[PDB]
Amino acid sequence: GGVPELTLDIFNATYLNLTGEIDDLEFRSEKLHNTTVELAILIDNINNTLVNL
Amino acid sequence: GGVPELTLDIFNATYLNLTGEIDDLEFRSEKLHNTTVELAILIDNINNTLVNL
Amino acid sequence: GGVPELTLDIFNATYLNLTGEIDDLEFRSEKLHNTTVELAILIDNINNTLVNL
Amino acid sequence: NQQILANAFNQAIGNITQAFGKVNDAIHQTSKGLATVAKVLAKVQDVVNTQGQALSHLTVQLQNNFQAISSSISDIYNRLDEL
Amino acid sequence: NQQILANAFNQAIGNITQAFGKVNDAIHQTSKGLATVAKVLAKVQDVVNTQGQALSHLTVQLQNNFQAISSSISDIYNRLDEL
Amino acid sequence: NQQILANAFNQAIGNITQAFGKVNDAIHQTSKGLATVAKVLAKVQDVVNTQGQALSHLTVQLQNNFQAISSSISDIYNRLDEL
């Protein structure tokens, strides 16, 4: 018996970078929030147009 | 030759627990569904206000 | 001293297949886009009904 | 003038109902989208956690193995030195 | 009265169009959001799967290595006992 | 006729405001949903990256270990052959 073959593949990690996407999501979620505020305004405005004849 | 240094770092796993978020998503998806049902009602109601003069 | 017990559990990978979901998302995102185009049309149509008496 | 206004109103209403219908479709789509995300998460959690667990267990096993190997080598050298 | 109603209608219409515009913006945002999610998934799938594959391959390799080491040690002890 | 139209308008308006309210609720829900996704991503990124890093480091360590073991075995055989 001789020296055994002990091969081992080095794993070279590919890192998951999601910060841009993050982020992009964050931006969408706050844009939707701001839309809710504006829409509340516009809704009360539509309510103000009820006629009293 | 002596005994070789064979160090090996134990990996202590951090478990990903997404059940709250899950869940929160689930809740949003069903709230949006319920909104669709209410909106169908309100749409037919707006349709009922067509005048026939 | 004898031969040491060197057990090693083979890890049998379960592959994450997200292509259907992908995909389903893709489909939703384009349906929402198409909705934006139709809604732009309908909005200009509502704007055309302003009376000039 | 009154008929004109009435006609305008009716036109507006039809268009408004159509617009709301489109928005409803969009809401439906969003609902579906979020549910899909929720499902995907479950899958990822499981695979990821499984992998982490295996990795952890693997290192424990490896530590044991290497410890045993070290002991074995030490004993071998003792025997060799006695020879 | 008729002019009043007409004015009310016009005001309502303007506001209604604005409201629909805002909702359209929101829908656009949602569309973008879902697409981003779709992209993220691709990335995660790939990294996660790659990691799993590597881990699996790693264990196979390790099993082979340890088997060879065990054989080697056995042979060494045979030689030592013959000595 | 004019009162009729006026009544229709008012009814339409009430319903329209209610509809917009519902859509606003939906938009709010969507906002929340996207933020949750954003948070989840952070978590996944971290765990996944940590796992990858550990795996990489683990293989480097293993390579070192096996290299040392190979050297050791070679030396042992040299000693045995000298015996």
Residue numbers in the entry:
A (entry chain B), B (entry chain B), C (entry chain B): 1324 to 1376
D (entry chain A), E (entry chain A), F (entry chain A): 1059 to 1141
Study text:
During the fusion process, two heptad repeats, HR1 and HR2, in the S2 domain, assemble into a six-helix membrane fusion structure termed the fusion core. The formation of a six-helix bundle (6-HB) fusion core brings the virus closer to the cell membrane and promotes membrane fusion and infection.
Then, three HR2 helices pack in an oblique, left-handed and antiparallel direction into hydrophobic grooves on the surface of this trimeric coiled coil, forming in a six-helical bundle structure with dimensions of ~116 Å in length and 30 Å in diameter with a left-handed supercoil. To compensate for their longer HR1 regions, the HR2 region of CCoV-HuPn-2018 also contains a 14-residue insertion that folds to a longer HR2 helix. Besides the nine-turn helix, between the N-terminal Val-1326 and Leu-1341, plus from the C-terminal Thr-1372 to Leu-1376, HR2 has an extended conformation, contacting HR1 residues 1101–1134 and 1059–1068, respectively. On the contrary, in the helical region of CCoV-HuPn-2018, residues on HR2 mainly engage residues on HR1 through side-chain to side-chain interactions via not only hydrogen bonds but also salt bridges. Overall, the fusion core structure of CcoV-HuPn-2018 is very similar to other Alphacoronaviruses, such as HcoV-229E and HcoV-NL63.
